[PDB]
Design an enzyme around this catalytic site. Structure first.
Site, PDB file in Angstrom:
ATOM      1  N   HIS B 460      11.992 -17.078 -11.256  1.00 46.78           N
ATOM      2  CA  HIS B 460      12.415 -17.384 -12.639  1.00 46.78           C
ATOM      3  C   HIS B 460      13.534 -16.445 -13.003  1.00 46.78           C
ATOM      4  O   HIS B 460      13.416 -15.242 -12.713  1.00 46.78           O
ATOM      5  CB  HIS B 460      11.240 -17.197 -13.594  1.00 46.78           C
ATOM      6  CG  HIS B 460      11.588 -17.397 -15.029  1.00 46.78           C
ATOM      7  ND1 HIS B 460      11.757 -18.648 -15.599  1.00 46.78           N
ATOM      8  CD2 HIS B 460      11.800 -16.497 -16.025  1.00 46.78           C
ATOM      9  CE1 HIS B 460      12.056 -18.506 -16.878  1.00 46.78           C
ATOM     10  NE2 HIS B 460      12.112 -17.214 -17.156  1.00 46.78           N
TER      11      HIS B 460
HETATM   12  C1  LIG Z   1      15.838  -6.394 -18.286  1.00 47.90           C
HETATM   13  C2  LIG Z   1      14.700  -7.164 -17.679  1.00 47.90           C
HETATM   14  C3  LIG Z   1      14.976  -8.268 -16.870  1.00 47.90           C
HETATM   15  C4  LIG Z   1      13.959  -9.005 -16.271  1.00 47.90           C
HETATM   16  N1  LIG Z   1      14.276 -10.098 -15.483  1.00 47.90           N
HETATM   17  C5  LIG Z   1      13.291 -10.833 -14.876  1.00 47.90           C
HETATM   18  C6  LIG Z   1      13.586 -11.971 -14.086  1.00 47.90           C
HETATM   19  O1  LIG Z   1      14.735 -12.398 -13.854  1.00 47.90           O
HETATM   20  N2  LIG Z   1      12.531 -12.666 -13.535  1.00 47.90           N
HETATM   21  C7  LIG Z   1      11.230 -12.285 -13.757  1.00 47.90           C
HETATM   22  O2  LIG Z   1      10.335 -12.921 -13.242  1.00 47.90           O
HETATM   23  N3  LIG Z   1      10.933 -11.212 -14.525  1.00 47.90           N
HETATM   24  C8  LIG Z   1      11.965 -10.469 -15.089  1.00 47.90           C
HETATM   25  N4  LIG Z   1      11.635  -9.405 -15.893  1.00 47.90           N
HETATM   26  C9  LIG Z   1      10.190  -9.043 -16.052  1.00 47.90           C
HETATM   27  C10 LIG Z   1       9.408  -9.825 -17.093  1.00 47.90           C
HETATM   28  O3  LIG Z   1      10.037  -9.745 -18.353  1.00 47.90           O
HETATM   29  C11 LIG Z   1       8.004  -9.238 -17.154  1.00 47.90           C
HETATM   30  O4  LIG Z   1       7.448  -9.131 -15.838  1.00 47.90           O
HETATM   31  C12 LIG Z   1       7.088 -10.101 -18.022  1.00 47.90           C
HETATM   32  O5  LIG Z   1       7.666 -10.370 -19.287  1.00 47.90           O
HETATM   33  C13 LIG Z   1       5.737  -9.411 -18.177  1.00 47.90           C
HETATM   34  O6  LIG Z   1       4.910 -10.278 -18.924  1.00 47.90           O
HETATM   35  P1  LIG Z   1       3.681  -9.738 -19.807  1.00 47.90           P
HETATM   36  O7  LIG Z   1       2.777 -10.894 -20.198  1.00 47.90           O
HETATM   37  O8  LIG Z   1       3.075  -8.629 -18.984  1.00 47.90           O
HETATM   38  O9  LIG Z   1       4.282  -8.968 -21.048  1.00 47.90           O
HETATM   39  P2  LIG Z   1       5.512  -9.262 -22.000  1.00 47.90           P
HETATM   40  O10 LIG Z   1       6.176 -10.594 -21.790  1.00 47.90           O
HETATM   41  O11 LIG Z   1       6.437  -8.066 -21.997  1.00 47.90           O
HETATM   42  O12 LIG Z   1       4.827  -9.329 -23.463  1.00 47.90           O
HETATM   43  C14 LIG Z   1       4.327  -8.159 -24.049  1.00 47.90           C
HETATM   44  C15 LIG Z   1       4.433  -8.382 -25.533  1.00 47.90           C
HETATM   45  O13 LIG Z   1       3.497  -7.571 -26.211  1.00 47.90           O
HETATM   46  C16 LIG Z   1       4.115  -7.027 -27.361  1.00 47.90           C
HETATM   47  N5  LIG Z   1       3.348  -5.814 -27.723  1.00 47.90           N
HETATM   48  C17 LIG Z   1       3.395  -4.577 -27.137  1.00 47.90           C
HETATM   49  N6  LIG Z   1       2.488  -3.799 -27.757  1.00 47.90           N
HETATM   50  C18 LIG Z   1       1.852  -4.526 -28.724  1.00 47.90           C
HETATM   51  C19 LIG Z   1       0.841  -4.223 -29.642  1.00 47.90           C
HETATM   52  N7  LIG Z   1       0.231  -3.054 -29.565  1.00 47.90           N
HETATM   53  N8  LIG Z   1       0.383  -5.170 -30.533  1.00 47.90           N
HETATM   54  C20 LIG Z   1       0.950  -6.427 -30.491  1.00 47.90           C
HETATM   55  N9  LIG Z   1       1.940  -6.731 -29.584  1.00 47.90           N
HETATM   56  C21 LIG Z   1       2.370  -5.801 -28.701  1.00 47.90           C
HETATM   57  C22 LIG Z   1       5.573  -6.856 -27.013  1.00 47.90           C
HETATM   58  O14 LIG Z   1       6.303  -7.080 -28.176  1.00 47.90           O
HETATM   59  C23 LIG Z   1       5.807  -8.015 -26.062  1.00 47.90           C
HETATM   60  O15 LIG Z   1       6.300  -9.159 -26.732  1.00 47.90           O
HETATM   61  C24 LIG Z   1      12.630  -8.640 -16.506  1.00 47.90           C
HETATM   62  C25 LIG Z   1      12.340  -7.513 -17.325  1.00 47.90           C
HETATM   63  C26 LIG Z   1      13.374  -6.777 -17.915  1.00 47.90           C
HETATM   64  C27 LIG Z   1      13.128  -5.585 -18.804  1.00 47.90           C
END
Ligand SMILES: Cc1cc2nc3c(=O)[nH]c(=O)nc-3n(C[C@H](O)[C@H](O)[C@H](O)COP(=O)(O)OP(=O)(O)OC[C@H]3O[C@@H](n4cnc5c(N)ncnc54)[C@H](O)[C@@H]3O)c2cc1C
Ligand SMILES: Cc1cc2nc3c(=O)[nH]c(=O)nc-3n(C[C@H](O)[C@H](O)[C@H](O)COP(=O)(O)OP(=O)(O)OC[C@H]3O[C@@H](n4cnc5c(N)ncnc54)[C@H](O)[C@@H]3O)c2cc1C
Ligand SMILES: CC1=Nc2ccc(Cl)cc2[C@H](c2ccccc2)N1Cc1ccccc1
Ligand SMILES: CC1=Nc2ccc(Cl)cc2[C@H](c2ccccc2)N1Cc1ccccc1
Ligand SMILES: [Cl-]
Ligand SMILES: [Cl-]
Ligand SMILES: [Cl-]
EC number: 1.8.1.12
Lengths: 489, 488
Positions: B460
């Site tokens: 992705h």
């Molecule tokens: C610059 C960058 C580029 C990336 N590019 C890619 C890519 O090309 N392909 C890919 O597969 N992955 C990529 N990633 C990685 C991807 O974004 C993460 O692996 C993914 O979003 C993780 O998903 P998640 O469900 O763990 O958390 P997230 O999607 O990060 O969601 C966590 C959410 O929880 C919220 N939150 C935090 N603390 C609290 C709280 N205490 N109370 C309420 N809400 C809270 C935050 O606001 C956030 O919205 C990239 C990451 C970065 C930083």
């Protein structure tokens, strides 16, 4: 007197890649009542991530657009070779226009996800900072400070921790003069001189981005504390990417690490490395890593155990040491990728609320790096494979394609590598660099889950002319590892 | 000396693979005959074959050139600014760069002969004199000076194919794709005749390099272009060619072409409709090139279709005479011909016999935008399987909402046997489709099921990840009948 708290089968903390897939599936497929908490409803400062998660707001989705924008620098130049003529001195890269386009695109996704909350029965969104007051109570407060006012106290049968990760900022003098990827998405002007700190995909991707948009006489520099950028990736590729970045004018500083940053009189940044060396830049973007975002959850209230590295410890099914508490995505410090978080949330909801226990497979996962040109990869690198198999084979093809002889971008070597278990021909890993690598690699993922052998690749008839057909023309190993050591024998 | 283990008539995709495996992997003495040592008029094809000289290789460079029409425009949406009115597409530059690259390949193929022992190349026209004799003559005329006779243990026919030109009055004022590769100026008005991939691909090339006020028209005698391809994609590519300014004239066939004194062409169609254009490129089909071989002299059999008849091991009815490549009138594709030739050598001079598999061959159309496909289309599936399911995904990717090319939908489709979930075909439209399909070809050797695709984790953000996000059928065919829901 007293009155009832809002009550849910499942409260999810973090409205991101993983928590949205969990919340959605539990509500729409299993008729559960679901609460989902996030700190902002749309992207940007102050909190950067928001409804949608990191990928949507400040990762995969806006970066890819920005990388695509960065590619036009190459396209405009390379077009001359096919006969395109136009006034080259009229060309200007407008960063503001790119940021505004990207901002519109992200907001539309934000609004779209809010609409889906509004329209879905049993799926509620809660704005604010979530933490564990006790085993079945999630509080949502005004800010991350645990003493800010409670907005809501949610009763939760099951609690899913999905707060993702956050940029690591090293404790060095002047760290407060640096930024992360977060702020990089919001720079009002494109920086003239930037240092991206770190050797991983984020550092590498943003370097290309900044390289395309920098103004007159700007310079992009990337530093990494070790010998060779992109640790974790195929070795030939790490070297090719190094040369190809360099060729597009980016300065790579291997074996250097910042020791401190001071502010210059004119507002620029003066960076001193551990080696004594210095560098002045308009922007210092720290991209040395991401750490599980656990600090605001108040996990001590319930005794959820961490790993030594700081992630929430979980079993193969995403269960913590506390019953009815689960954790998926970056907070668990496995593979930090969107579709793994997505896969994890789905698996977790099938297990807890469905009748299909399932665990996410973290091996053989395909992924990309949107460097210019990009990397696409799936499975084991050769030095990992050699340590786990007696006899590994490596097949390698590498050549500048013909289009890039005509285009003038001769430094653009395409690299294709297949790593085998030579005792049975099973493909263990596939490693690509060159235009379209990320698209080529997807069906290779399906291949490895089908235990494809090298002979399946070579027996397939190629599509001509493509880069991908190289994966189907390789018959003879370039070389082997026999109990750990390289040769052609 | 003038006796060889193998004589190949035609130094092309299939022949050169066979010529090289025999000499290098088996130590055989090999002769290969072709009419010209490099590309272009008079004979167009030459050492290298059709793909190298007037086919896959130069056309891919030229479609690559044509894509910059889109790139330059789409760049504005990403903040790129430059003087749009200074933009010009220089065809002569493109053709000169194509000519140089192709010539480099000719020359390097000449090198490999000169440097390779027991692999010899002969200039001129090959024909069968007797069962173990191949004559090389000066021209394609049977009655012209002999240049050589080579005695042959084994003979390979690999002369490929040739544009089919219909017997309408004024056919002689039309060109084929052969001449299209060498036009000195890009046509202002051009009619491409044919619904197949050469016509479609060339229409997109001319559309990009056309001078101001120019117009490309494609015509097809039936209702919908790209017969044999996925129906959704046929309709969708049609709309996206129309959105980029190409006129698609279906249900129309030229009955007459006449030459204006100013050099332009006045085309009268069967409907009595007429059209004036600078160039009429006939791309209605390609026929097996068998006329100059003198097949009569040994009685090698041709099918009711024109092609040399063969069994699965490339054998004709004349023992020790084989045929591979477009001369066989099956799948006319470079890598197939290459596979056929190597399999033939493995069989004749090697250990184990080997036969080319013609099923599940992945292929592409380098239209703008491009198509990638492997396996059965749904309507063919619905005739051979009682329940078939179709998984479809079709939407304008986000990059093209910003780019301004809103018309550019990406189409992904998986066709399954719904009874056991086996993937019967995958079909794609959009940027990347030819690259994406390659490894799908491998999945289909491994008898992949829809669940193997859905259970794989996406990369992705990509278009390809769409293949790994489909679990609910869009519609089905039951007993040949199309329907949205299953009946029970
Ligand atoms: C610059 C960058 C580029 C990336 N590019 C890619 C890519 O090309 N392909 C890919 O597969 N992955 C990529 N990633 C990685 C991807 O974004 C993460 O692996 C993914 O979003 C993780 O998903 P998640 O469900 O763990 O958390 P997230 O999607 O990060 O969601 C966590 C959410 O929880 C919220 N939150 C935090 N603390 C609290 C709280 N205490 N109370 C309420 N809400 C809270 C935050 O606001 C956030 O919205 C990239 C990451 C970065 C930083
Ligand atoms: C415009 C165009 C685009 C194409 N694009 C693609 C594509 O993108 N992908 C793909 O897979 N396929 C493509 N093809 C098809 C591909 O070129 C052919 O399938 C392939 O070249 C056939 O190989 P072959 O070995 O049968 O013979 P060829 O490569 O056709 O070689 C035949 C050779 O025989 C020579 N010859 C003929 N008669 C004699 C004679 N009597 N004596 C001596 N020599 C003789 C000719 O000079 C020629 O060099 C394209 C074809 C065309 C016309
Ligand atoms: C199925 C789904 N999974 C998600 C996974 C990760 C993210 Cl970041 C977003 C979604 C999205 C979604 C949107 C609002 C609430 C819950 C889930 N969502 C709903 C959806 C349906 C149809 C098309 C697009 C999105
Ligand atoms: C193996 C091989 N197969 C071919 C198939 C089709 C064509 Cl059109 C050309 C070749 C090419 C070749 C070149 C000269 C003589 C015979 C074969 N050739 C030699 C070669 C070796 C290594 C790299 C590239 C080409
Ligand atoms: Cl700007
Ligand atoms: Cl011109
Ligand atoms: Cl492509």
């Amino acid at each position: 007197g007293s009155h009832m708290s809002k009550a849910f089968d499942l409260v999810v903390i973090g409205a991101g890649s993983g928590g949205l897939e969990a919340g959605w599936n539990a509500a729409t497929l299993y008729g559960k009542r679901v609460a989902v908490v996030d700190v902002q409803t749309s992207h940007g400062p102050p909190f950067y991530a928001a409804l949608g998660g990191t990928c949507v707001n400040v990762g995969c989705v806006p970066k890819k657009l920005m990388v695509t924008g960065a590619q036009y620098m190459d396209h405009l130049r390379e077009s001359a070779g096919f006969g395109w003529e136009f006034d080259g001195s009229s060309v200007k890269a407008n960063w503001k226009k790119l940021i505004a386009a990207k901002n519109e695109a992200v907001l539309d996704i934000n609004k779209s996800y809010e609409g889906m909350f509004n329209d879905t029965e049993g799926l509620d969104f809660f704005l604010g900072w979530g933490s564990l007051e006790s085993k079945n109570v999630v509080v949502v407060r005004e800010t991350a400070d645990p003493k800010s006012a409670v907005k809501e106290r949610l009763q939760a049968d099951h609690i899913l921790l999905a707060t993702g990760s956050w940029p690591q900022m090293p404790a060095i003098p002047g760290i407060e003069h640096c930024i992360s990827s977060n702020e990089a998405f919001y720079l009002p002007e494109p920086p003239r001189r930037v240092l991206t700190v770190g050797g991983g995909f984020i550092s590498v991707e943003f370097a290309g981005i900044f390289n395309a948009y920098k103004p007159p006489g700007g310079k992009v520099t990337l530093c990494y504390r070790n010998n060779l950028i992109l640790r974790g990736f195929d070795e030939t590729i790490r070297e090719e990417v190094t040369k190809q970045l360099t060729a597009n004018g980016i300065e790579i500083m291997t074996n250097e690490n910042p020791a401190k940053v001071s502010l210059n009189t004119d507002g620029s940044k003066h960076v001193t490395f551990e080696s004594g060396k210095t560098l002045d830049v308009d922007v210092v973007m720290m991209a040395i890593g991401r750490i599980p975002r656990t600090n605001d959850l108040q996990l001590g209230n319930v005794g959820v155990k961490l790993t030594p590295k700081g992630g929430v410890q979980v079993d193969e099914f995403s269960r913590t040491n506390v019953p009815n508490i689960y954790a998926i995505g970056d907070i668990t410090d496995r593979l930090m990728l969107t579709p793994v978080a997505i896969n994890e949330g789905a698996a977790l909801v099938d297990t807890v609320f469905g009748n299909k226990p399932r665990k996410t497979d973290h091996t053989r996962v395909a992924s990309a790096v949107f460097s210019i040109p990009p990397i696409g990869t799936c499975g084991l690198i050769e030095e990992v494979a050699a340590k786990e198999f007696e006899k590994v084979a490596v097949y390698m093809s590498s050549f500048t394609p013909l289009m890039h002889n005509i285009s003038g971008s001769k430094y653009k070597k395409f690299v294709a590598k297949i790593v085998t278990n030579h005792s049975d021909g099973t493909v263990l890993g596939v490693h690509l660099l060159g235009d379209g690598a990320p698209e080529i690699i997807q069906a290779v993922g399906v291949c490895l889950r089908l235990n494809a052998k090298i002979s399946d690749f070579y027996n397939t008839i190629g599509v001509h002319p493509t880069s991908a057909e190289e994966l189907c023309s390789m018959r003879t190993p370039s070389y082997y590892y026999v109990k750990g050591e390289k040769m052609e024998k």
